Amino acid sequence: MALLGTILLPLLGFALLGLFGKRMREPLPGVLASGLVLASFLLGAGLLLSGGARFQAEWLPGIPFSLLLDNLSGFMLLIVTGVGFLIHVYAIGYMGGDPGYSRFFAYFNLFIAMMLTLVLADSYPVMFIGWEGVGLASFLLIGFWYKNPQYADSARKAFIVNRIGDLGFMLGMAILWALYGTLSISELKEAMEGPLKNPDLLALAGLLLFLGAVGKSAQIPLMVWLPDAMAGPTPVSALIHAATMVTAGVYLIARSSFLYSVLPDVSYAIAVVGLLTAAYGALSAFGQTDIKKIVAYSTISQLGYMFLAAGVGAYWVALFHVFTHAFFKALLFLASGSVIHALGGEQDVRKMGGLWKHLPQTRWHALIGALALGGLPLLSGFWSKDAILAATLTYPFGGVGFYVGALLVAVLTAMYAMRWFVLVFLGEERGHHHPHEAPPVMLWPNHLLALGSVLAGYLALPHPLPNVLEPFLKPALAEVEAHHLSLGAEWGLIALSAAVALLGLWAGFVFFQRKVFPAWYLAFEAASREAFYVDRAYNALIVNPLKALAEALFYGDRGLLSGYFGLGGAARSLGQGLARLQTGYLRVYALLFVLGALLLLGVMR
Amino acid sequence: MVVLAVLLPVVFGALLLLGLPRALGVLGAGLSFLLNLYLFLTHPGGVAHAFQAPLLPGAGVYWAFGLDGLSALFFLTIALTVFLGALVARVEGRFLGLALLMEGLLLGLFAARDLLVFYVFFEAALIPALLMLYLYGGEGRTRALYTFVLFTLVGSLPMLAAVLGARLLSGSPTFLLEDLLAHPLQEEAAFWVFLGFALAFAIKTPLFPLHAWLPPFHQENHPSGLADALGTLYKVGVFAFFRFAIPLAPEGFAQAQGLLLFLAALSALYGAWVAFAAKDFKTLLAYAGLSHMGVAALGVFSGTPEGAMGGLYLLAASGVYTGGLFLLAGRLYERTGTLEIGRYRGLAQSAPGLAALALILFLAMVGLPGLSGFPGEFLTLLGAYKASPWLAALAFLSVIASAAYALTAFQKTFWEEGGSGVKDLAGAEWGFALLSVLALLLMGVFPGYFARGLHPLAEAFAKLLGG
Ligand SMILES: CCCCCCCCCCCO[C@@H]1O[C@H](CO)[C@@H](O[C@H]2O[C@H](CO)[C@@H](O)[C@H](O)[C@H]2O)[C@H](O)[C@H]1O
């Protein structure tokens, strides 16, 4: 019941801003929102500290309503509600003088409540309330300033492309019901102890579940929806890209670890898609000429890293990275939000540069952040990245092919991060803005993130060094694994991660300060800005043909009705043919008569 | 008890037709609503409030009524939907009496405990349906009407051949459902009887090639679309299958079942797919209804207690939000003047949380969990996959199309650039919103309570298809 409290608080709260909301002055909705998130984080962390929590109740027969709060759930709850809280308090600042304060924070509480319903769920359908709910709240928020045609289609694409994966979720969900008949993650895990059954079919279910995950965490092929999610206010992008949404993509794999750990075939594909998403996202990352999109592609890529982690059987690691990332991505986005709250939403890069002096404290934010993403050897993103890279080699499913790839991507990530920082804060100036106006409630929570960024790192250090994130996560879920490691070899790897990271960062610092970009940085700034021409290809035989087929089948249906009318006219024709039999001539009547008599007589005897 | 609840809209409607005014009939829809709701929260089991009276005995025809778990749920659904239509209205050419008349006719239709009386109501309800189509709106009133009427009746009258055969070939004493079931037909008799039920029920479901009456019908009714809501409550086909066509001639249902699952599936996908192209709320909602019924019929046709319960539930709950979307389309029509989606773009900010009401409804329609559509859609998926996984998938290449049409229409009708402006929300429209969303949220959040009575009927009429 109290567990359900954590969910109901940002809903009992949400409803007030929709029902009333405009009835209030304009520091308030943010205060209520952030207050309920405050006492959701808090009064759910009390539960976590109390050892955990449960809820089971009335729903459709055979499919009960269950919330489980364990370690794996508590971790997500703290990430979501905490980082979410900070982003709320920031949003109190960045959203100001904007009508729809109530709309914004109602949608925010809605979002939080949905995400909590997602993570706190012991049955896949309740989790599905979570998924569709969060997608819906994303839709509402991406198209927040609705008076814009672009910032509507953005959200449309969100709640459609996402629903493509949601369909897979449903399908696999049904397979794991025809098969087992429980549909509750706990008893679905306990029934998957043993020999399993129809492993091919089980693989199918897990594969559709994964194809579900793809949309929500914006992996390929459903990658395409996320860059367009930039439309909504900046802190919305922060929540979607860091603390919520895409996190569920990984989290679903982590809960369903009992299912994927027994699937050699599928996990391989999961890791491969993870790496492909990472590489793609990273290559098309830096070509972006917008501060927003260029970070969105880092979201896509990094989540690719996570799916590569969870792919190879290292489930606790993917969440470590999810955590660090939850900090430094929120940091990055909120930083950019402050930056364009300072430039009046200029939101460009080549039209920017040299904000180093004029912007106090923001430069440090974006530097700590961009370096954490780059993987500065004594920062979070570093430890998570080397954790993943080593987990590649050490775990089942090979990882030797993957490792080198993830390393190249590890270079490229540093490169585009430094492109971002340089292009934003360095190299002369363009435009006009005066004093500061990077206010308390914007830089204050943004400060706290930068701390969390640096110190997220050592919660899980390599083997001999104290690791507290593994013994917390593993008991809750994902227990089965086979990992061989060697001391000093692994440190050769960690040192390689550090060296290559520093190297990449350093290269990026000069390369994207350069001002001369020869031959194929034209041939790269084109493709990469256009995401390697992927959307243009998705509207090739995927979208527009279907869009056309709607009309095609419409007019077809019109033709069907038309044909029925044709039957009508057939009866009309036959009818006026039978009525044409009566000429009015009596001799004719006599002929038809005698004929008829002969007919009836002919039938009987 | 039952006959009181069946007759109450009929008399109030009759008192309305001649007598007038509206309000006395609106509180009539309210009285029927409260009575039916009270009836939902009371009954223990299948029999409920039985009724048996002689009608033609010697023919075997009796006035027989009663509330299954199913009948109760539909009495609630219908009473609610029609009531919402009543207090919102803006039709009120005093044919809200015709509306209540059709309500009572449908209530009798679902309470009908014997075949011939069921038939009686099935066809009798056609009368208001055709009237409020003729004399209350539409340029193409006449073609929509003769199409709708001729379709349902060309399906219907040959069913009479089957309803007779159901009793005659089985040697059943009367037309009572119980007796008819106590006397099974043999093969190639059960075949024919099931077929004769099946054309009339598929065409009134509607299934794919037999749905062509649906778009003209929904266009040419009064632009408010009360008659459209009630037309959607007259979509009793799936229910008719489940209660009647299938149990009375299962041997034939077995042969037809593959084809039926097929038609249901592609009806869902097709409906939702061409629903995109619709350039007016009437056509859009119509094809959307075709999709939903596709899903429901898929649920029933599967066997599978899950799927059947899901399908019936989906029908029930979709009555409310489909009727509601129709009524709302009428309410923005009244303030704008057209059911064209494109013209008069941005309405939100001019209108209050009317955007919220419309969006809640659209989300219920696309079947967002927590709203009425999802529970039924989901149990249906569960059962369909059991029956034929491939058609479950084909049919469920739907949710994509649903989000497509619903969100496209919603965006182009509400979200975009500000127009002239509008009214906010009427004192009636507020009752509408409140009661509606209350309903959607309750049936979506507690699909436990509703459909408890669906459970025994589901598994029993599933085992019917077993040994
Ligand atoms: C059990 C009780 C039921 C509780 C559930 C009720 C929740 C309803 C809220 C749904 C969305 O509500 C949303 O917020 C308001 C409410 O009028 C609307 O917003 C309108 O008023 C706000 C108030 O700040 C204005 O800023 C804004 O410019 C305007 O668009 C908006 O149209 C709607 O989309």
- The token pair at B464 is 């019917």
**Contact between chains at A60 and B447 (C-beta distance less than 8 A):** yes
The domains of chain A, with CATH numbers, are 1-529 (no CATH), 530-605 (1.20.5.2700)
Q: Whose CA is nearest to atom 30 of ligand 1?
A: B349
Q: Which one of B279, B407, B446 would you mutate to disrupt binding with A, by most A Cβ within 10 Å of its Cβ?
A: B407
Which residues have C-beta within 8 Å of that of residue B18, sequence separation ≥ 6?
none
Beta bridge partners of A279: none
Q: Which is nearest to B138 in space by CA: B231, B19, B271?
A: B231
Residue labelled with tokens 């069921």: B118
For A200-211, what is the HEC assignment?
A: HHHHHHHHHHHH
Closest ligand 1 atom to the C-alpha of B349?
A: 30
Resolution of this PDB entry, in A? 3.3
Please indicate whether, in this complex, the C-beta atoms of A146 and B404 are within 8 angstroms of each other. no
Whether residue A166 lies within 8 A of chain B, CB to CB, comes out as yes
Q: Is B418 on the interface with A (CB under 8 A)?
A: yes
- DSSP conformation class of A348: -
Which of A103, A109, A139, A140 has most ligand 1 atoms within 8 Å of its beta carbon, as the pocket-test mutant? A103
Method of determination is X-ray
Using an 8 Å CB-CB cutoff, list chain B residues near A139: 407
CA distance B435 to A598: 71
Nearest beta carbon to residue A167 from set B399, B448, B451: B399
Closest CA to B455 of B45, B134, B181: B45
What distance in Å separates the CA atoms of residue A301 and residue A61, rounded to the nearest whole number? 41
Give phi and psi for B352, each to the nearest 5.
Answer: -75, -135
Q: Is the peptide bond before B184 cis (omega within 30 degrees of 0)?
A: no
Q: How far apart are CA B250 and CA B443, in angstroms?
A: 31
In this structure, what are the phi and psi dihedrals at residue A467, rounded to the nearest 5 degrees? -120, 115
Angle CA(A485)–CA(A487)–CA(A491) in degrees, nearest 5?
105
Residue that has been written with the tokens 């979070």 in this structure: A380
Residue type, A562: S
Atom 9, ligand 1: residue with shortest CA distance: A18
A65-69/B51-54 β-pairing: unpaired
E strand or H helix at A54: strand A53-57
Query: How far apart are alpha carbons A461 and B457 in whole angstroms?
Result: 59
Q: Which residues of A touch B349 (CB under 8 A)?
A: 147
Measured between beta carbons, the chain A residues lying within 8 angstroms of B294 are none
Residue type at position B213:
W
* Three-state SS at A184: strand
Please give the backbone phi and psi of residue A509, each rounded to the nearest 5 degrees, phi first: -65, -40
Residue B36 contacts residue B79 (beta carbons within 8 Å)? yes
- CA of B190, closest CA in chain A: separation in Å? 29
**Chain B residues with CB-CB distance to A164 below 8 A:** 400
Answer yes or no: are the C-beta atoms of A310 and A254 closer than 8 Å.
Answer: yes
What's chain A's length in residues? Answer: 605
A357: burial class by Cβ within 10 Å (0-12, 13-18, 19+)? exposed
Find the A106 Cα to ligand 1 centroid distance in Å.
8
Q: What is the dihedral of CA B455, B456, B461, B464, to 10 degrees?
A: 130
Interface of A with B in 532-591 (CB under 8 A): 547, 549-551, 553-554, 556-557, 560-561, 564-565, 568
Burial class (CB in 10 A: 0-12, 13-18, 19+), B94: middle
Q: Do A553 and B277 touch (CB under 8 A)?
A: yes
User: Which residues of chain B lie closer than 8 angstroms to A180, CB-CB?
Assistant: none
Query: What is the rounded (10 degree) CA torsion for A489, A494, A500, A506?
Result: -150
N-to-C CA span, chain A: 86
Alpha-carbon span B444 to B402, nearest angstrom = 18
Q: Which atom of ligand 1 is the closest one to the Cα of B354? A: 32
Inform me whether the C-beta atom of residue B153 falls under 8 Å from chain A C-beta atoms.
no
For chain B, report the end-to-end CA distance as a whole number of angstroms. Answer: 36
Q: Nearest-CA distance from A511 to chain B in Å? A: 43
Contact A146 B378 (CB under 8 A): no
* DSSP bridge pairs for A184: A123
- C-alpha B107/C-alpha B319 separation (Å) is 14
Is the alpha carbon torsion for A287, A293, A295, A301 positive or negative?
A: negative
SS3 labels along chain B: CHHHHHHHHHHHHHHHHHHCCCHHHHHHHHHHHHHHHHHHCCCCCCCCCCEEEECCCCCCCEEEECCCHHHHHHHHHHHHHHHHHHHHCCCCCCCHHHHHHHHHHHHHHHHECEHHHHHHHHHHCHHHHHHHHHCCCCCCHHHHHHHHHHHHHHHHHHHHHHHHHHHHCCCCCCCEHHHHHHCCCCCCCHHHHHHHHHHHHHHCCCCHHHCCCHHHHHHHCCCCCHHHHHHHHCCCHHHHHHHHHHHHCHHHHHHHHHHHHHHHHHHHHHHHHHHHHCCEHHHHHHHHHHHHHHHHHHHHHCCCHHHHHHHHHHHHHHHHHHHHHHHHHHHHHHHHCCCECCCCCECECCECCHHHHHHHHHHHHCCCCCCCHHHHHHHHHHHHHHHCHHHHHHHHCCHHHHHHHHHHHHHHHHHCCECCCCCCCCHHHHHHHHHHHHHHHHHHHCCCCCCCCHHHHHHHHHHCCCC
Of A58, A128, A152, the CB nearest to B416: A152
Number of H helices, E strands in chain A: 25, 2
Sort out which chain B residues have CB atoms less than 8 A from A146's CB and list them: 346, 348, 414-416
Ligand 1 neighbours (beta carbon < 6 A): A 15, 18-19, 21-22, 99-103, 106; B 348-349, 352-353, 355-356
What DSSP character marks residue A181?
S
> H helices of A95-123, where?
101-119
Rounded CA-CA distance B320/B69 in Å is 18
Q: Are A251 and A73 within 8 A, CB to CB?
A: no
Determine whether the interchain pair B278/A163 forms a contact, defined as Cβ–Cβ distance below 8 Å: no
Rounded Cα distance between B433 and B373, Å, is 18
Q: Does the beta-carbon distance from B349 to A147 stay under 8 Å?
A: yes
Atom of ligand 1 nearest to the CA of A103: 14
Residues in A closer than 8 angstroms to B397, CB to CB, are: 167
Residues in Cβ contact with A462 at an 8 Å cutoff, skipping those fewer than 6 apart: A386, A387, A390, A490, A491, A494
